[PDB]
Amino acid sequence: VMKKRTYCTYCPSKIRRKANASCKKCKKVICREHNIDMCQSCF
């Protein structure tokens, strides 16, 4: 059920920002333009 995980989970799907980073604790992929490696919803 983990689809569209090529695009930053913090970025809206209409924006389509490629996720170069991924938050390890939740495995949600993120753009460094939003969060550096770790998503704000963890720790």
Burial of 29 (0-12, 13-18, 19+ CB in 10 A): buried
Q: Which residues contact 40 (CB under 8 A, 6 or more apart)?
A: 10
Cα–chain center distance at 8: 3
- Report if residue 22 touches Zn ion, rule: CB under 5 A: no
- Report if residue 42 touches Zn ion, rule: CB under 5 A: yes
Of 1, 4, 36, 39, the residue at the interface with Zn ion (CB under 5 A) is: 39
When the beta carbons of 5 and 23 are compared against Zn ion, the nearer one is 23
Residues near Zn ion (CB under 5 A): 8, 10-11, 17, 23, 25-26, 31, 34, 39, 42
